Design a protein around this ligand. Structure first.
Ligand SMILES: O=S(=O)(O)OC[C@H]1O[C@@](COS(=O)(=O)O)(O[C@H]2O[C@H](COS(=O)(=O)O)[C@@H](OS(=O)(=O)O)[C@H](OS(=O)(=O)O)[C@H]2OS(=O)(=O)O)[C@@H](OS(=O)(=O)O)[C@@H]1OS(=O)(=O)O
Length: 120
């Protein structure tokens, strides 16, 4: 069930809509969500991972992902949470004071349902 954080449904990028985007110079997390996005209407290893999590707001399932340290993160997948923790351990402060199992118990989903990354 799709839905955005503002309480409105995601927006579809049609045939006429994509022809405009192709002529403009790429934008609004197109690489992860080109067709259905919530951002349409209203260099290090850790950096790339933070850029992905930044794009979780544009996800057509952003409402389901963000709503269940004071760290605002979407419900991550078991493998990705573990990956993000170790890659951003020296860069994010509180990460060195905890373990991967402890961090992913509160920030990752063990249910087996929808989790971030949405995209493959
Ligand atoms: O032609 S469009 O598909 O681009 O739709 C044009 C505008 O329709 C609204 C409001 O409806 S209206 O008042 O009757 O004009 O929303 C409609 O579109 C979304 C899907 O997004 S999409 O990219 O426009 O296709 C529907 O949501 S959902 O079915 O995917 O859940 C809306 O359904 S609903 O209101 O949530 O029930 C649908 O409305 S309706 O069924 O046609 O009535 C506008 O969206 S709005 O600006 O957020 O109010 C669209 O305007 S827009 O400028 O293209 O954004």
């Amino acid at each position: 069930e799709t839905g955005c954080l503002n309480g409105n449904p995601p927006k579809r990028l049609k045939r006429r809509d994509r022809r405009m985007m192709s002529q403009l110079e790429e934008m609004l997390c197109g690489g992860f969500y080109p067709r259905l996005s919530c951002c349409l209407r209203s260099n290090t290893e850790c950096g790339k991972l933070l850029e992905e999590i930044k794009c979780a707001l544009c996800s057509p399932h952003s409402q389901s992902l963000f709503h269940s340290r004071d760290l605002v993160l979407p419900l991550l997948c078991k493998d990705y949470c573990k990956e993000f923790f170790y890659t951003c351990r020296g860069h994010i402060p509180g990460f060195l004071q905890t373990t991967a199992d402890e961090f992913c118990f509160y920030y990752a989903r063990k249910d087996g349902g929808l989790c971030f990354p949405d995209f493959p």
